[PDB]
Amino acid sequence: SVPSQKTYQGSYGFRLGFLHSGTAKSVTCTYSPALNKLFCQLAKTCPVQLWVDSTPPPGTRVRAMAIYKQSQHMTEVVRRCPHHERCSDSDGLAPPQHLIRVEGNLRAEYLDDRNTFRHSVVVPCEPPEVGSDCTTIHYNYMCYSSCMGGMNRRPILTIITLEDSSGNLLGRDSFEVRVCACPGRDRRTEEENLRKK
Ligand SMILES: O=C(O)c1cc(I)c(-n2ccc(F)c2)c(I)c1O
Ligand SMILES: [Zn+2]
């Protein structure tokens, strides 16, 4: 009833990577290594790199799922709030309840788990474009961390799993997410709080 968040590189040496976007007031997505935390604006592009040491088999897929970070909320399904699930901002593929979307990939599949009711979005693994050393997925987060009746100020983490064609685990990584109006300032604030602690 709670998905694992254990980092697991597995046989293929799977791990995530993030750009270095800085903390200017205008930034729309920025990752803090010190906090292992992505800060992003509502519905804006979040580039997440996938890195491996060796090529996984054809049919390998990459799944994203959100869970609440705090143990007393971990069993609650992370979903969009009562406002955003009704705002008809559909892309034709993502169910309106799903917090996490993949942008610009017609092969993205969205799962409502029949037993846990949790949401996830999964895409096929594709090799890097010629001249690149990693593959990038573009995610969108479709509610603010603060949305009442949804995340309601509770922190979440995104779990990224590398899976075989049956859905068996090959690799896992994760990061905390805050969806907020000013990710640059919030990253600076939280990094300073960490330093002061
Ligand atoms: O180099 C390759 O040949 C190569 C092949 C693949 I399929 C992938 N890959 C894509 C998504 C993922 F989770 C892993 C990657 I990243 C690669 O660097
Ligand atoms: Zn919302």
Residue numbers in the entry: 96 to 292
Article sentences:
The tumor suppressor protein p53 is inactivated in the majority of human cancers and remains a prime target for developing new drugs to reactivate its tumor suppressing activity for anticancer therapies. The oncogenic p53 mutant Y220C accounts for approximately 125,000 new cancer cases per annum and is one of the most prevalent p53 mutants overall. It harbors a narrow, mutationally induced pocket at the surface of the DNA-binding domain that destabilizes p53, leading to its rapid denaturation and aggregation. This pocket is conveniently located distant from the interfaces involved in DNA-binding and protein–protein interactions, presenting an opportunity for intervention using small molecules stabilizing the DBD functional fold.
SAR development using a diiodinated salicylate model system identified several halogenated pyrrole motifs as promising substructures to target the buried subsite 3 in the Y220C pocket. Notably, 3-fluoropyrrole derivative 21 reproducibly displayed the highest protein stabilization and affinity from our library (ΔTm = 1.9 °C, Kd = 15 μM) and represents a moderate improvement on the unsubstituted parent 4. In this preferred axially chiral conformation, the fluorine engages in hydrophobic contacts with F109, L145, V157, and L257. C220 adopts a “flipped” conformation with the sulfur atom 3.9 Å from the fluorine, probably precluding fluorine–sulfur contacts due to the positioning of the biaryl scaffold. Fluorination of the 3-position of the pyrrole provided a modest although reproducible enhancement of Y220C thermal stabilization.
